């Protein structure tokens, strides 16, 4: 209906995490690859991405994002974000990246 947040977690155990999230949100993954899984959750509106970690023992934040409706929304956000003094990097618009002050990366992207 509108844009949704994208939470990408680096997880130590991809299979265990798929099963927990399937129970948390009541649905199975939309896509499953080696080392990668994703969920398109309708309520709460969310794109949850699970990325299999290499070394560490605990789940960490990999990146955050805002999944918008069409490519045109990406360009609108890109223009909005720049007029604000935020340093943006565009991929070609299909994706814009900005980084928060503590280093957390955000992508605004069309799916």
End-to-end CA distance of the chain: 13
Minimum Å gap between C-beta 63 and Ni ion is 6
Tell me the residue length of the chain: 111
Residue 57 or 96 with smaller CB distance to Ni ion: 96
Residue 61 or 72 with smaller CB distance to Ni ion: 61
**DSSP per-residue string spanning 34-95:** TTEEEEEETTTTEEEEEEE-SS-SS-EEEEEEEEESSHHHHHHHHHHHHHTT---EEE---E
How far apart are alpha carbons 81 and 97 in whole angstroms?
10
Minimum Å gap between C-beta 103 and Ni ion is 16
Minimum Å gap between C-beta 66 and Ni ion is 10
How far apart are alpha carbons 11 and 66 in whole angstroms?
20
- Answer yes or no: is 107 a known binding residue: yes
Contact string (CB under 5 A) for Ni ion, positions 2-21, x = contact:
------x-------------
- Answer yes or no: is 76 a known binding residue: no
- Answer yes or no: is 6 a known binding residue: yes
Q: Which residues belong to the annotated binding site?
A: 6, 62-63, 107
Residues that bind Ni ion (CB under 5 A): 8
Question: Per the annotation, where are the binding residues for roxarsone (III)?
Answer: 62
């Amino acid at each position: 209906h509108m844009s949704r947040v994208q939470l990408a977690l680096r997880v130590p155990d991809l299979e265990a995490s798929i099963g927990f999230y399937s129970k948390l949100f009541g649905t199975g993954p939309a896509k499953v690859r080696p080392g990668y899984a994703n969920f398109a959750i309708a309520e709460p509106p969310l794109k949850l991405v699970l990325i299999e970690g290499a070394g560490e023992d605990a789940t960490r934040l990999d990146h955050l994002g805002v999944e918008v409706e069409d490519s045109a929304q990406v360009g609108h956000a890109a223009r909005r974000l720049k007029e604000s003094g935020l340093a943006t990097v565009e991929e070609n618009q299909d994706k814009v990246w900005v980084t928060g002050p503590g280093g957390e990366p955000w992508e605004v992207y069309v799916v």
